[PDB]
Design a protein around this nucleic acid. Structure first.
Ligand SMILES: Nc1ncnc2c1ncn2[C@@H]1O[C@H](CSCC[C@H](N)C(=O)O)[C@@H](O)[C@H]1O
Lengths: 32, 125, 121, 29, 72, 189, 126, 202, 144
RNA sequence: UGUCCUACGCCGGCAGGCGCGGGUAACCCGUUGAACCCCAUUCGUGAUGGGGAUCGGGGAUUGCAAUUAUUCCCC
């Protein structure tokens, strides 16, 4: 395929996987 | 379990994700019949009409496209939909079904599985 | 005479900061940007020439190179010798030249001003 | 064949003052 | 020569439309205006009238071309 | 059945000319849904003979500069042209089209040669591929110069061009231009 | 529809002929001083349906078009939208249409000639 | 490309080419511009109406320029479509239909001059087996030399495609007894380079 | 099981959404609505007299798709081709005040609020409104 | 592409103003929301709602300075 097209394919194929796995306030205190 | 493929045109790259389902096809979150150039609607529906509505009933495909243009994306969408099914029928259905899908899908139009190796030519001094 | 519905006599009473709206957009920007020392000195020289002149003829001619200085309403009646690069043009400032510059009354260029064979043998 | 009307510094045709506007006459045989 | 197509229906040609145009085998804004000598603005405005009155079947609707047909 | 535009069938199209069977490509293997395919039909000699006949029609209406590139507009036109051809005549618009290519092909042409001044003509015969290359060109320039400045839409100028050519009428631009090419060739044996 | 019984083929507005076949938004543009842009907002302020031709407008609504386009400022036509802004002589905002456009243009020519400006001299010589 | 590549003049200048020739802004300009130079090129005396020949008249643009300058003329052309457009323009002179390769059908010693604006080069090509360029050029100039009165002049504007057509026209012209030369206006320009055969009988 | 915005025709959705906003009567329509071009590259004013509602409807629909859009982002959406006389054409943005006054008008409808990391987004009540109207879009079109 | 690219908020109808941030950069502009293209509306063969030159009046910006129109916008 080549360097430029494959870079966009791999980046796009990764981002479709993440929105399958996807389907608060930070802990300011450390001792409960 | 699922299968993750790609199909391409000049710069319009597609990725398709197919798994068990009831037969819904989505592109960028939209159905296959709402993709914007309605003149080339049959190019989106060729792998569905060639194979039949029953053959796609055991799979749900979700396609993402980025880059290219209005008709370059349609040629990449129809490639990765058909290429996703021939990969899914290979790994989880017997090869006899995969051979007969790959047979009738090449004799119609060779660009549904093997990509077009045409890209813009650069200019040199 | 009226200029923008304002006669000459209270236009002479009128100061600079309320002359802003009576001029056009170009002259309004120029007056905000200020007037340099070159045109302050010239305005005094027209004021001096109008001072000592006899009150029944036009004043003496003032020669200058300032082609880019707009004509304020107090300049009317003056004798300005404006230079086109070759000679000084003597222009008498009528009250109808208020919004205009001085360079366009001394034109720096001249107009341009621009038998077939018949065989015998 | 019209060589006296040819402009040296530019491709085209330049007029002369003694002679008429540019032309070329060649007789027959 | 120059076209002096009418911009509104007179009494003679309005009857000529309502008894002849729904039997042509093709009805189009452009083919009506060539024979009835009317402007194309009314040539399409007369056909949406006939469509609402049910005298004509619609074949295609498009921003560039509109195609109409007889009933039977 | 694979139908053109979803409503035109390629089964019933019968080509009457023996010479043009290999080159008018609309039959069961070349039946496609749309005249858009983006196929590489000009990378090799006689590759375009296998191109479907309607795609060659749409590629030839992309002409005269301002329309160079716009193919989605030309497939729009041939879609509307076939729906008018069915209306006026009543049979398959593909059958009307393949009769037009047959009747608009010059069977004999002339070439221009000249050694010194004397430019004369000799009549030569026309290959079966150029009988199609000339026929599509004459129908497309027939419909283009038909309207260009009147209220007639190109969709119904192209329908009125293909219908007249299939009838063999002299009202066609293609038939009138074909016959004068035949008339010059007869005079220049 | 049909021609009304009181349809006008030619309308006499501001001593020019206004064609009645043309649509009202663009038949008004035949008079000078109004264009495709001024005549659209004038017909919007008059509350006149723009689908009508210029021929079937009756004597009522054709006269309130005139008193709008001759007198625009009391119908909220904004000050920037007028062609004749602050005059040289009497600085006020107006919209000159039929002969006022030609007279103001002529007056702007002879003003530049009398003062012998460069712009007025090159108009004279050219 | 060039109009002569299309075919015979009777078929190329058909009904549809005749219309767009009339409404052709470049054609209306330059056809009369060359006819002004070509009428001036034959040195005929002023204040004297003459009788001229308009060979290859076509639409009659060059014919109308003579009539507006006080002359009278007759036009000879081969295609009926350009002759029909000449009638519709309400021209003054007479019109004749015929091929100048077959001869000009007039009595000897008739015309005070002959005018030609872009018609001559249609004889250097023969699109019939019966036609020969050499004999059709000679049958033109021999009949022209008969019909033209002695001492008169014929000025011919023509559009050659190479150097050989200029030669092949000239030798046929000088073999019928004509004397003169070639007048080239702006001989080293491109748009204004016009060729003029000035021919006169002694 | 409920239909969403993406599952229907976007052209039919704007016609339904603008028809909804007009019937509510709570949009704040500015006074210069009948006298302005809504882009510097236009030759004329909009043909439709109620152009503000369809612009308002198309603003909400575009904010649903990609949130965080400001005034500068929406002038870039609605820009087009400026034919610069005899010079070659270029791309020019829309008019900023029309884009701004729409976003103020949607805020008065309690449909749009500002975003802490940028421009504007949709209200949780806003997205409840648009997804309901997509129900009537598909019911009258896909079920007929 | 860049320390000159710009995001966002407010004002004006537009050119354009005021404020506050990101980015020496596969980090911000920028998911570079480009134009033809696609779908609806009006126009209807008319030098016409094609074509825009040449002009008149006004407004805004950069500059020591805009006159012989720096440039941009409106009628
Ligand atoms: N062999 C021939 N004999 C006579 N006329 C001929 C000819 N070949 C061509 N012509 C004529 O030459 C004409 C050229 S058209 C030019 C005519 C004229 N200059 C005008 O513009 O009005 C055509 O009308 C054609 O009819």
């Amino acid at each position: 395929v080549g360097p430029r097209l494959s870079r966009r394919i791999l980046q796009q194929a990764r981002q479709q996987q993440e929105e399958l796995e996807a389907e608060r306030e930070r802990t300011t205190r450390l001792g409960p | 379990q699922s299968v993750q493929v790609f199909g391409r045109k000049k710069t319009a790259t597609a990725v398709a994700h197919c798994k068990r389902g009831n037969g819904l096809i989505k592109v960028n979150g939209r159905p296959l019949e709402m993709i914007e150039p309605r003149t080339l609607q049959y190019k989106l529906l060729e792998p569905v009409l060639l194979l039949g509505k029953e053959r796609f009933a055991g799979v749900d495909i979700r396609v993402r496209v980025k880059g290219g243009g209005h008709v370059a994306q349609i040629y990449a969408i129809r490639q990765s939909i058909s290429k996703a099914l021939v990969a899914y029928y290979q790994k989880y259905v017997d090869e006899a079904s995969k051979k007969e899908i790959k047979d009738i899908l090449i004799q119609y139009d060779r660009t549904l599985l093997v990509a077009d190796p045409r890209r813009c030519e650069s200019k040199k001094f | 005479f009226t200029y923008r519905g304002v006669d000459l006599d209270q236009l002479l009473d009128m100061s600079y900061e309320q002359l802003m709206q009576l001029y056009s957009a170009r002259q309004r920007r120029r007056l905000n940007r200020g007037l340099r020392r070159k045109q302050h000195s010239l305005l005094k020289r027209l004021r001096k020439a109008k001072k000592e002149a006899p009150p029944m003829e036009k004043p003496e001619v003032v020669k200058t190179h300032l082609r880019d200085m707009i004509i304020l309403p107090e300049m009317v009646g003056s004798m300005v010798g404006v230079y086109n690069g070759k000679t000084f043009n003597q222009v008498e400032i009528k009250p109808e030249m208020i919004g205009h510059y001085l360079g366009e009354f001394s034109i720096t260029y001249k107009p341009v001003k621009h038998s077939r064979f018949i065989p015998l043998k | 064949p019209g060589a006296e009307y040819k402009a040296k510094k530019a491709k085209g045709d330049v007029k002369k003052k003694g002679r008429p506007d540019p032309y070329a006459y060649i007789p027959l045989n | 020569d120059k076209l002096n197509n009418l911009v509104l229906f007179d009494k003679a040609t309005y009857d000529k439309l309502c008894k002849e145009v729904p039997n042509y085998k093709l009805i189009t804004p452009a083919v009506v205006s060539e024979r009835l000598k009317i402007r194309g603005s009314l040539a399409r405005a007369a056909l949406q009238e006939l469509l609402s009155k049910g005298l004509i079947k619609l074949v295609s609707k498009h921003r560039a071309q509109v195609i109409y047909t007889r009933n039977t | 059945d694979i139908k053109l535009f979803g409503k035109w069938s390629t089964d019933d199209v019968q080509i009457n000319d023996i010479s043009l069977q290999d080159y008018i490509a609309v039959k069961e293997k070349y039946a496609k849904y749309l005249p858009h395919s983006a196929g590489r039909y000009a990378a090799k000699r006689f590759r375009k003979a296998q191109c479907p006949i309607v795609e060659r029609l749409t590629n030839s209406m992309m002409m005269h500069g301002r329309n160079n590139g716009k193919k989605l507009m030309t497939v729009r036109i041939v879609k509307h042209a076939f729906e008018i051809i069915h209306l006026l005549t009543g049979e398959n618009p593909l059958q009307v089209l393949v009769n037009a290519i047959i009747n608009s092909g010059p069977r004999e042409d002339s070439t221009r040669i000249g050694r010194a001044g004397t430019v004369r003509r000799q009549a030569v015969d026309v290959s079966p591929l150029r009988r199609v290359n000339q026929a599509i060109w004459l129908l497309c320039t027939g419909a283009r110069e038909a309207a260009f400045r009147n209220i007639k839409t190109i969709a119904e100028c192209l329908a009125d061009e293909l219908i007249n050519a299939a009838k063999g009428s002299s009202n066609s631009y293609a038939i009138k231009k074909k016959d004068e090419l035949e008339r010059v060739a007869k005079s220049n044996r | 529809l049909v021609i009304p019984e009181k349809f006008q083929h030619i309308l006499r507005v501001l001593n020019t002929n206004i064609d009645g076949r043309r649509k009202i938004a663009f038949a008004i543009t035949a008079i000078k001083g109004v264009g495709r842009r001024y005549a659209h907002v004038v017909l919007r302020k008059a509350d006149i349906d723009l689908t009508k031709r210029a021929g079937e407008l009756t004597e009522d609504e054709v006269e309130r078009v005139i008193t709008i386009m001759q007198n625009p400022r009391q119908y909220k036509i904004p000050d920037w939208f007028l062609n004749r802004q602050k005059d040289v002589k009497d600085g006020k905002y107006s919209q000159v249409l039929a002969n006022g456009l030609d007279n103001k243009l002529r007056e702007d020519l002879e003003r530049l000639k009398k003062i012998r400006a460069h712009r007025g001299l090159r108009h004279f010589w050219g | 490309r060039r109009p002569e590549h299309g075919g015979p003049p009777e078929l190329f200048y058909d009904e549809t080419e005749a219309r767009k020739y009339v409404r052709n802004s470049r054609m209306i300009d330059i056809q009369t511009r060359m006819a002004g130079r070509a009428l001036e090129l034959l040195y005929l005396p002023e204040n004297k109406p003459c009788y001229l020949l308009d060979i290859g008249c076509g639409t009659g643009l060059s014919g109308s320029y003579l009539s507006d300058e006080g002359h009278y003329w007759v036009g000879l052309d081969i295609s009926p479509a350009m002759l029909d457009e000449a009638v519709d323009r309400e021209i003054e002179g007479d019109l004749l239909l015929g091929d100048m390769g077959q001869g000009i059908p007039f009595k000897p010693g008739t015309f005070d001059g002959c005018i030609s604006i872009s018609a001559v080069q249609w004889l250097c090509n023969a699109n019939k087996k019966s036609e020969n360029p050499a004999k059709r050029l000679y049958c033109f100039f021999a009949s022209l030399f008969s019909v033209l009165v002695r001492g008169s002049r014929a000025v011919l504007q023509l559009y050659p495609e190479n150097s050989e057509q200029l030669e092949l026209i000239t030798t046929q012209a000088t073999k019928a007894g004509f004397s003169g030369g070639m007048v080239v206006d702006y001989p080293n320009s491109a748009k204004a380079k016009k060729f003029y055969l000035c021919l006169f009988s002694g | 099981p409920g239909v969403t915005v993406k599952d229907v025709n976007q052209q039919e959705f704007v016609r339904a959404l603008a028809a909804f906003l007009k019937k509510s009567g709570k949009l704040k329509v500015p006074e210069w609505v009948d006298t302005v071009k809504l882009a510097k590259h236009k030759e004329l004013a909009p043909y439709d007299e109620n152009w503000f509602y369809t612009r308002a409807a198309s603003t909400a629909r575009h904010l649903y798709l990609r949130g965080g859009a400001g005034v500068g982002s929406m002038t870039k959406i609605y820009g087009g081709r400026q034919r610069n006389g005899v010079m070659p054409s270029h791309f020019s943005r829309g008019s900023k005040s029309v884009a701004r006054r729409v976003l103020q008008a949607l805020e008065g409808l309690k449909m749009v609020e500002k975003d802490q990391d940028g421009g504007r987004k949709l209200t949780p009540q806003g997205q409840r409104d648009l997804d309901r109207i997509a129900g009537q879009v598909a019911a009258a079109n896909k079920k007929h």
